[PDB]
Design a binder for this molecule. Structure first.
Ligand SMILES: c1cnn(C2CN(c3ncnc4[nH]ccc34)C2)c1
Length: 167
């Protein structure tokens, strides 16, 4: 039993809800929140800009030190950093950004990072400003993640479309 409330159950392990991941994180305080990161951990907009704003820029400060030490992430890769006031940990995962020409086949690799964590609160990778089809992102998620994932979809119209078209 965990503290996630009001989710629709899609599969054995995948759950989905129309929610702002920021507000959901601040209420649940999950062990792991997933950030929709880029390789530079520059958290300017989308989910990343929103999560970073909610940390009063502490996420960005921590991220800049991470990059200065380690260099950029790989597309499809991840790193674990602090969750600040939102979660114990933030798993920064880099899904491919279609608006940069990155290979969508890397989306499965991105979701594989979730399997290193027993329970996660997450957005749909490569959706939104990353330019991929969110219906596709959901299929790859369901077919790749085996741990318990609670997906927050900010846009209510998108949420209803994802539920109504789910196989
Ligand atoms: C293009 C259109 N939208 N997108 C991302 C943004 N997003 C989110 N998912 C859950 N919570 C959120 N809070 C703030 C943003 C956000 C999906 C890319």
């Amino acid at each position: 039993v965990n503290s996630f409330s009001g989710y629709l159950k899609l599969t054995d392990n995948v759950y989905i809800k129309n929610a702002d991941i920021v507000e959901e994180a601040k209420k649940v305080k999950p062990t792991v929140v997933v950030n929709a990161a880029n390789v530079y951990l520059k958290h300017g907009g989308g989910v990343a800009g929103a999560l970073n704003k909610a940390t009063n820029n502490a996420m960005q400060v921590e991220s800049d030190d991470y990059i200065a030490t380690n260099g950029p992430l790989k597309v499809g890769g991840s790193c674990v950093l602090s969750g600040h006031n939102l979660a114990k940990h933030c798993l920064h995962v880099v899904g491919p950004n279609v608006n940069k020409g990155e290979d969508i086949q890397l989306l499965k690799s991105a979701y594989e990072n979730f399997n290193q964590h027993e329970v996660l609160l997450a957005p749909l990778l490569s959706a939104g400003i990353f330019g991929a089809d969110p219906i596709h992102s959901l299929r790859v998620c369901v077919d790749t993640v085996r741990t318990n994932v609670y997906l927050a979809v900010f846009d209510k119209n998108l949420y209803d479309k994802l539920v109504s078209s789910f196989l």
